[PDB]
Design a protein around this ligand. Structure first.
Ligand SMILES: CCC1=C(C)/C(=C/C2=NC(=C\c3[nH]c(/C=C4\NC(=O)[C@H](C)[C@H]4CC)c(C)c3CCC(=O)O)/C(CCC(=O)O)=C2C)NC1=O
Ligand SMILES: CCC1=C(C)/C(=C/C2=NC(=C\c3[nH]c(/C=C4\NC(=O)[C@H](C)[C@H]4CC)c(C)c3CCC(=O)O)/C(CCC(=O)O)=C2C)NC1=O
Ligand SMILES: CCC1=C(C)/C(=C/C2=NC(=C\c3[nH]c(/C=C4\NC(=O)[C@H](C)[C@H]4CC)c(C)c3CCC(=O)O)/C(CCC(=O)O)=C2C)NC1=O
Ligand SMILES: CCC1=C(C)/C(=C/C2=NC(=C\c3[nH]c(/C=C4\NC(=O)[C@H](C)[C@H]4CC)c(C)c3CCC(=O)O)/C(CCC(=O)O)=C2C)NC1=O
Ligand SMILES: CCC1=C(C)/C(=C/C2=NC(=C\c3[nH]c(/C=C4\NC(=O)[C@H](C)[C@H]4CC)c(C)c3CCC(=O)O)/C(CCC(=O)O)=C2C)NC1=O
Ligand SMILES: CCC1=C(C)/C(=C/C2=NC(=C\c3[nH]c(/C=C4\NC(=O)[C@H](C)[C@H]4CC)c(C)c3CCC(=O)O)/C(CCC(=O)O)=C2C)NC1=O
Ligand SMILES: CCC1=C(C)/C(=C/C2=NC(=C\c3[nH]c(/C=C4\NC(=O)[C@H](C)[C@H]4CC)c(C)c3CCC(=O)O)/C(CCC(=O)O)=C2C)NC1=O
Ligand SMILES: CCC1=C(C)/C(=C/C2=NC(=C\c3[nH]c(/C=C4\NC(=O)[C@H](C)[C@H]4CC)c(C)c3CCC(=O)O)/C(CCC(=O)O)=C2C)NC1=O
Ligand SMILES: CCC1=C(C)/C(=C/C2=NC(=C\c3[nH]c(/C=C4\NC(=O)[C@H](C)[C@H]4CC)c(C)c3CCC(=O)O)/C(CCC(=O)O)=C2C)NC1=O
Ligand SMILES: CCC1=C(C)/C(=C/C2=NC(=C\c3[nH]c(/C=C4\NC(=O)[C@H](C)[C@H]4CC)c(C)c3CCC(=O)O)/C(CCC(=O)O)=C2C)NC1=O
Ligand SMILES: CCC1=C(C)/C(=C/C2=NC(=C\c3[nH]c(/C=C4\NC(=O)[C@H](C)[C@H]4CC)c(C)c3CCC(=O)O)/C(CCC(=O)O)=C2C)NC1=O
Lengths: 160, 158, 108, 162, 160, 54, 58, 162, 158, 160, 162, 58
């Protein structure tokens, strides 16, 4: 998180946190309630988000659910929807943490090897993430939508 | 357990050496203060009921909320547990005073007491207030010989 | 010595996917190597705690244990990995419901 | 490392669940104490040298044989190593307080410390006493609430060594 | 004996003899004739076994019979050879019985306290028993020598 | 107090390797004996001992 | 100091029958301290046992 | 490492003898199987990614709890490490088959692997199941004789782990 | 505890299958090594006192600080506990050698041993050095047949 | 020590001691009686050295023993004199050793950190070492005075 | 490493005492033996290769199966490793003789050497025999008083390996 | 492959001074393999150093 990054930075220099690192922690702590409200808004609407995101993905990319596609069939489509649910939960984790570190440690490190083994096309993951970003940021307020769009953007850049 | 003499013996043995002049001076100081320390311990033992009565009164006059419903000393059972804990503190303070060392308090009393109180919801600040009240009551009787042992219990609890 | 599982993971992935040369290239190009040994000092066994440069207490203990060892002293992995379990896995064993045998005068 | 927030995240990620109401309660509880922790860390940073000086004085006053010939703190290198250890304990306890979690103490302080001290002949009970002296000095410095919080990580170091 | 051991095991959990217990008893009954042969050879040769063991023991450590030694004097040396004969007789008992319970009950339980009280050096007794083992194995076949050697080593281990 | 290897109980270093407090630094201009000695220091610390000739 | 030897027969009616040997529990004579005389007296009475004999050797 | 030829060489060197008829039979036997081994190694190398995909899919179908939350193969990192380890087993089995000797599996794989997995918490029974899945998948590619040969080394790995 | 036969039986039962040819071969291989393992176990049992004596001598020759004042082997009681631990290691490694399985070591020796040593301050690397010295002595007498079992104990402590 | 330094330099090259290092050791051992006499002379008069050195130091730097000074008060002045005595003892150690290794490893490594923690002024330490040097070299002949002065100079440089 | 001088310094420093007459007697004895030690060190360094040649010749004469196939010193690589081991033993024995102290043998030679030899299969009794051969040859070279001095460190190595 | 000679000046402005000789690692000319070039280029930049000369031997 923000606190973890500040402490790792201070420890890597073998020193107490500077005024800058304490300012980072202080600004993070002040924003905690808004972060929880955002993450709770996303959590209560998890099923609607995943359903609409899957709909936009499969409309924009019918070849994914067409015969010969990676997500063809009910089981493979359900596993695609399950992966979108994973990444939405990871986005909420990142929001409460104030940084993308939970996202990286659970769903980005080794992701390209995993989807290479699964033959899941990474471009399709990118438009799935962009779809889920549009759907999720639609539910939030203007100030909050940009902040969570940053997490979705990081995850999309990590898949690409 | 450990008293002062066993502490000195353990130190010298861990260094693998015989007693020297400094250790003999230390043990002689222990033997010199021993008689006053037994007098204090016997006086505390003889007046233990009075000490508990006064210290419990002082605690529950300072903090009347403990006895009212919802307080941690509100029942016959929780009040009996409270005065029992004060009895423990006084008895082990007398042990430490005779031993001349506080390791018996660390081992038999303090280790696990914080977790016991947190588990049960005993208010540790109020227990420290009770230990302080006991320290005053006892000092009014024997002098200042047991002050360090009650201070040890108070630092360990806080 | 390696101090935690992340230190092991970095170089084990480098050995698993790219071989020995890539792992050596990565390890001598780290900033710790540059700060401690630099460019023209032979690497040496390190014995003073220096957490900013990787000598945390576990690195120290592992280093003094491995540097106390002759070459080919044994084949054991002194740092097989850091993790929740033990090397023999006895925590995973099944415990007997009753001791194998019980002592009674009536039982003889 | 793992702070309190990442600890909650890990507990909910192993179970594969989105955040429940109790998770948001724990997160709000952590955020509620953030300013107090930051103030305590700033204070401890300002007075770190004073804390170490006072606590080392207290430790050596209670156990004078540590610094006399034959003690494990008798040489300038050994005295310096001891005060350096106390400095480490205070800095990492401040880190743990800021994080609200004892994980960093485990991964970077306590793991292997007891075997290290055993192999070097460092008296562990005396080290626990030094940590207790630091706890008293630091608590008096930072006040009631910050003391109640710093004492948790001081006691964590003490229990790990004990 | 070997039968009593199986019967005790069966009686401990209040059941009839198990197949393993039956097999143990059957093996003991089958080995009975070899046991009788080994015991008879050990018994008919007892005197010279004891003589050789005593001579070799005294030669190894002469302080036993030296003045101030525990075997010093005619009576104490006679008791020494008596102890050696006792241990050999117990060895034959164990060979016949198929276990060590006769040796334990007659001569091993309490011998440690006895010799500690009487200031008997246990290493000297162990040396005498090793010498008796060598003398016995000298006049036995290899299988019979091993069969006796198990009980001789049991006695030696009980000494220590 | 004096002349103790770091490590306490494990204050040992196999004689095949370099003494635990020795440093070897390459300098631009140095004698050829120093160049040789630094080469055996490199082999001694990387391969843990001196190689056979060749 | 004084001790009591007590002889009691405790039937096993309340319990079910078991293939394990139980005769030692049913009929016994045991040596107890005086401070333990009342607890085991009541314990034997609780189990339906009958006190057959009481002796104090001195 | 030791291959079959150097295994014969080591036996005869240790006993200090030139090759005799028996050594020459062992060497002829190795050379005769050489083309089959080279063919199988080329086939496995060309198909290694496909073999790993099929085997990991069969393993995670048979044990879905591994890749769901709370499983040892649950994260992108731990899934990647799982199939990485499967790549190890396939590659080292191919080495041992090409060499015709299991010594490389002792030196380079099995030594300390149980301890690594028990320290990490990696389930070894599921790892053996994955090795079995790779055995069937590889046999599906290489044909009767090559399958029988590769199965020896897969079973050696299974026995060394289990 | 388990032995080789019981280990193979549990393996076949986890699959709910009968013994196949390979399982019978594994059990036959275990039966074939039984005589050598029994003679090795008897040899260890006959020389247990000497094995322990040379093992302790080797341990304390490597690390004489353990016996010096302040060492973890310094007292009659602490040295006694050290040699008793090595005696336990020897006896239970002999058991595991007879059974052919290391489960007896896990059940009876490593059941809290590492936690006990870390709690008491027993220096684990020194204990492993002692275990390895005892392994060397046992190997000098009977060969490598027991090495793995001793290694197990070392791995249980590390 | 000189011997240990030569052995370690030779061990750092995995060779036997060169003729030069053997010349070094012969020079060290031929001068042993002289430096032994010097060390005994310094040990015999330790009290006078410490007393005159304390007097000279407190004359030349009176703020140390004035109120607010680090050595103010009888007990703190005693501690000051005590570790002047420490450094005299280490100087005798270094003299018998032939080099400053005992001084370095007992009194110099971490000395600035130790005196930082103790609030002891470091220039005060240097001035105390210089005063000891004057008093100690006053008690010795010129050749001995120079050699002992070298060790005291090593202390003064190490503290400064 | 400690020498005689540093051994005395260590005892008196841990006791916090100045040198007394006993310390001066011990240091004086070391200075007295110093010339003999230096001469013996020079003689051993001048003849080191000759010592290794004669001692290994004796060792392989008494135990000729070591250098034949199946011996632990049969190969050029293992023979070279053996004579190199003997060379290191001789050089560290000379170091310890110069220092008048066996500390360098504990710190650089003996620790873990027995376990290494057991793990490699080096016959430790044959190694002790080679050390005894080096002792006999060295004592022949360096003369009676130096022989008594040098044999102490040779025997220290032999006992450490036995 | 190919080797590239880099002549670089890498100051020590980020840390305190020391008595040890330091000049050789501050200003240097070394040639490295092509696959090592990017890491060294970036390492020089990160420590505040300046790349003075780049040459391709051949
Ligand atoms: C928490 C981190 C984490 C993730 C994300 C993860 C993903 C993951 N996705 C899987 C299957 C899958 N995943 C997908 C998803 C794809 N379908 C379309 O192509 C899209 C582009 C894309 C999703 C938007 C599909 C189709 C499958 C089935 C593939 C197959 O079985 O052939 C599997 C194999 C096992 C299973 O089905 O449960 C994993 C492990 N695992 C993890 O531990
Ligand atoms: C809800 C259960 C509950 C009970 C039953 C209870 C009894 C109780 N009565 C107490 C004191 C007292 N109890 C009495 C009552 C006595 N005065 C006369 O002698 C009478 C014979 C007799 C009453 C009929 C008095 C006067 C005190 C206060 C004086 C003292 O300290 O002894 C105390 C000690 C704490 C205090 O001072 O309030 C308790 C715990 N407390 C509880 O929380
Ligand atoms: C010999 C050392 C020793 C100590 C110190 C000790 C303390 C102790 N106090 C306990 C309970 C208690 N202790 C208290 C006392 C508190 N009530 C508050 O109002 C007061 C401020 C404070 C006392 C001054 C109370 C009320 C309980 C009952 C808690 C409950 O059951 O809810 C218990 C749990 C057992 C019980 O229910 O009686 C322990 C173990 N035990 C020991 O063996
Ligand atoms: C960042 C976390 C961390 C810690 C805590 C840590 C402790 C630590 N202290 C050490 C030495 C030491 N530690 C002490 C401290 C002791 N002296 C007295 O006895 C006191 C009771 C006690 C301190 C209060 C001393 C004297 C030494 C030197 C021991 C020696 O070299 O002989 C060492 C050995 C390596 C070295 O000296 O640099 C470590 C690893 N290292 C770490 O990386
Ligand atoms: C053998 C190597 C060694 C040294 C040298 C050493 C120095 C040392 N000096 C100390 C106290 C002291 N040292 C001094 C000396 C200073 N006062 C003036 O400023 C002078 C400039 C200066 C002396 C010339 C004083 C005044 C104290 C007591 C101050 C205090 O209580 O902190 C202490 C604190 C422990 C104690 O009081 O016993 C140490 C460890 N320790 C060692 O193990
Ligand atoms: C069949 C069961 C049985 C055994 C085993 C047995 C041993 C035994 N030997 C005894 C005396 C003795 N035992 C020995 C023999 C020992 N001292 C020598 O040094 C040797 C080292 C060593 C024999 C190898 C001696 C010399 C005595 C006489 C010591 C005395 O008179 O105090 C005694 C004391 C009573 C007596 O004098 O007879 C016993 C009980 N007695 C038994 O009824
Ligand atoms: C292993 C040695 C052993 C023996 C021999 C033994 C006998 C025995 N039989 C008992 C009860 C009994 N035993 C019998 C059986 C008898 N009454 C019928 O008329 C039959 C003619 C006859 C049997 C053939 C009965 C009816 C009782 C219950 C009587 C009662 O307790 O009221 C009891 C009292 C415990 C109980 O009720 O279970 C014992 C101790 N117990 C032992 O541990
Ligand atoms: C049958 C299964 C079993 C095992 C395995 C066992 C080991 C064992 N060793 C113990 C203590 C000990 N163990 C040691 C041994 C160490 N001393 C060091 O110097 C050596 C490096 C090392 C031995 C090689 C020592 C000294 C103690 C006493 C520690 C103390 O009391 O402070 C303890 C704690 C209780 C006690 O003191 O008896 C156990 C349980 N006990 C068992 O019942
Ligand atoms: C398998 C690898 C291997 C080799 C090659 C080897 C060679 C070898 N040759 C030896 C002796 C010898 N080797 C020679 C050979 C030389 N004489 C002439 O000068 C020739 C130029 C030359 C041979 C063509 C001689 C003369 C000896 C006897 C040396 C002596 O008596 O001391 C010895 C000493 C042990 C013994 O005599 O049995 C070895 C170890 N050892 C090995 O483990
Ligand atoms: C200075 C302290 C020190 C010592 C002594 C030391 C010994 C040592 N000897 C080794 C191998 C060896 N050592 C020997 C020597 C033995 N074989 C012969 O039969 C003789 C009986 C005997 C010598 C007299 C041999 C043959 C090997 C090779 C074993 C192998 O590779 O299989 C090895 C394994 C690494 C290597 O091959 O270089 C070490 C570490 N290491 C040290 O740091
Ligand atoms: C032993 C051989 C050796 C020499 C000679 C040497 C000189 C030297 N001086 C340096 C820095 C410096 N040197 C100076 C020297 C001063 N500038 C002016 O103000 C003064 C007129 C002048 C001194 C009288 C300065 C100011 C710097 C810092 C420059 C900077 O970092 O911007 C540096 C760059 C690395 C560093 O900052 O430590 C070197 C290499 N280094 C060596 O290893």
């Amino acid at each position: 998180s923000v606190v973890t990054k500040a402490i790792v930075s201070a420890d890597a220099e073998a020193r107490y946190l500077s005024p800058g690192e304490l300012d980072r922690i202080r600004g993070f702590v002040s924003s905690g309630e808004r972060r929880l409200r955002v993450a709770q808004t996303l959590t209560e609407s998890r099923e609607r988000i995943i359903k609409q995101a899957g709909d936009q993905l499969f409309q924009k990319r019918p070849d994914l659910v067409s015969p010969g596609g990676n997500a063809y069939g009910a089981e493979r489509t359900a596993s695609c929807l399950r992966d979108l649910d994973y990444y939405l939960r990871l986005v909420t984790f990142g929001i409460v943490a104030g940084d993308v570190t939970p996202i990286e440690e659970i769903g980005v490190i080794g992701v390209k090897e995993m989807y290479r083994n699964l033959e899941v096309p990474l471009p399709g993951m990118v438009e799935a993430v962009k779809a889920m970003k549009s759907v999720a940021t639609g539910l939030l307020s203007g100030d909050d939508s940009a902040e969570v769009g940053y997490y979705f953007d990081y995850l999309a850049g990590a898949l690409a | 357990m450990l008293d002062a003499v066993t502490k000195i013996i353990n130190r010298t043995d861990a260094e693998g050496r015989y007693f020297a002049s400094k250790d003999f001076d230390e043990v002689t100081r222990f033997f010199a203060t021993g008689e006053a320390r037994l007098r204090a311990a016997s006086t505390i033992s003889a007046n233990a009921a009075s000490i508990l009565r006064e210290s419990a009164a002082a605690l529950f006059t300072e903090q009347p909320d403990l006895l009212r419903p919802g307080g941690n000393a509100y029942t016959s059972r929780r009040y009996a547990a409270c005065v029992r804990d004060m009895e423990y503190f006084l008895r082990y303070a007398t042990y430490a005073l005779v031993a001349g060392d506080t390791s018996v308090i660390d081992e038999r009393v303090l280790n696990g007491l914080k977790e016991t109180y947190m588990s049960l919801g005993v208010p540790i600040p109020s227990t420290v207030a009770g230990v302080t009240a006991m320290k005053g009551v006892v000092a009014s009787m024997i002098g200042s010989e047991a002050n360090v042992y009650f201070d040890h219990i108070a630092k360990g609890l806080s | 010595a390696p101090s935690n599982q992340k230190e092991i993971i970095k170089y084990h992935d480098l050995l698993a996917r790219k071989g020995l040369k890539a792992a050596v290239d990565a390890m001598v190009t780290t900033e710790e190597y540059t700060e401690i040994f630099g460019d023209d000092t032979v690497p040496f066994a390190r014995y003073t705690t220096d957490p900013a440069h990787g000598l945390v207490t576990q690195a120290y203990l592992g280093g003094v244990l491995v540097n106390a060892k002759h070459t080919y002293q044994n084949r054991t992995l002194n740092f097989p990995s850091y993790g929740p379990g033990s090397q023999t896995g006895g925590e995973q064993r099944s415990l007997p419901l009753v001791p194998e045998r019980v002592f009674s005068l009536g039982d003889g | 490392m793992q702070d309190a927030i990442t600890s909650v995240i890990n507990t909910y990620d192993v179970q594969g669940k989105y955040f429940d109401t109790s998770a948001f309660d724990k997160l709000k509880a952590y955020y509620a104490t953030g300013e107090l922790r930051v103030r305590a860390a700033g204070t401890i940073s300002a007075n770190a040298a004073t804390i170490i000086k006072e606590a080392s004085a207290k430790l050596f006053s209670n156990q004078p044989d540590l610094v006399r010939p034959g003690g494990n703190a008798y040489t300038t290198r050994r005295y310096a190593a001891c005060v350096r250890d106390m400095d480490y304990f205070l800095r990492y306890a401040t880190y743990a307080m800021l994080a609200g979690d004892t994980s960093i103490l485990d991964e970077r302080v306590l793991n292997g410390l007891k075997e290290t001290y055993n192999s070097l002949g460092v008296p562990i009970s005396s080290t626990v006493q030094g940590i207790q002296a630091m706890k008293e000095v630091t608590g008096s410095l930072v006040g009631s609430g910050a003391a109640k919080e710093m004492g948790v990580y001081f006691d964590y170091l003490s229990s790990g060594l004990s | 004996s070997a039968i009593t051991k199986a019967i005790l095991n069966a009686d401990a959990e209040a059941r009839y003899l198990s197949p393993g217990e039956i097999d143990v008893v059957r093996g003991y009954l089958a080995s009975g004739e070899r046991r009788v042969r080994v015991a008879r050879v050990l018994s008919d040769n007892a005197l010279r076994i004891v003589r050789g063991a005593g001579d070799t023991m005294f030669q190894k450590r002469p302080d036993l019979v030296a003045p101030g030694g525990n075997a010093y004097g005619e009576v104490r040396t006679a008791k020494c050879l008596r102890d050696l004969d006792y241990f050999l007789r117990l060895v034959t008992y164990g060979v016949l019985a198929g276990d060590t319970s006769p040796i334990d009950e007659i001569g091993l339980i309490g011998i440690k306290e006895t010799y500690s009280l009487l200031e008997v050096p246990v290493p000297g007794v162990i040396d005498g028993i090793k010498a008796a083992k060598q003398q016995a194995a000298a006049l036995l076949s290899s299988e019979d020598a091993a069969e006796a050697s198990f009980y001789f080593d049991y006695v030696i281990s009980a000494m220590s | 107090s004096v002349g103790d290897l770091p490590g306490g109980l494990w204050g040992v270093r196999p004689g095949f390797q370099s003494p635990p407090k020795q440093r070897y630094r390459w300098t631009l201009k140095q004698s050829k004996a120093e160049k040789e000695a630094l080469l055996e220091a490199i082999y001694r610390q990387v391969l843990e001992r001196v190689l056979p000739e060749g | 100091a004084r001790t009591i030897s007590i002889t009691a027969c405790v039937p096993r009616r309340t319990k079910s029958v078991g293939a394990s040997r139980e005769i030692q529990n049913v009929y016994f004579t045991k040596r107890i301290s005086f401070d333990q005389f009342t607890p085991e007296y009541q314990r034997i009475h609780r189990q339906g046992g009958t006190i057959l004999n009481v002796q104090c050797m001195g």
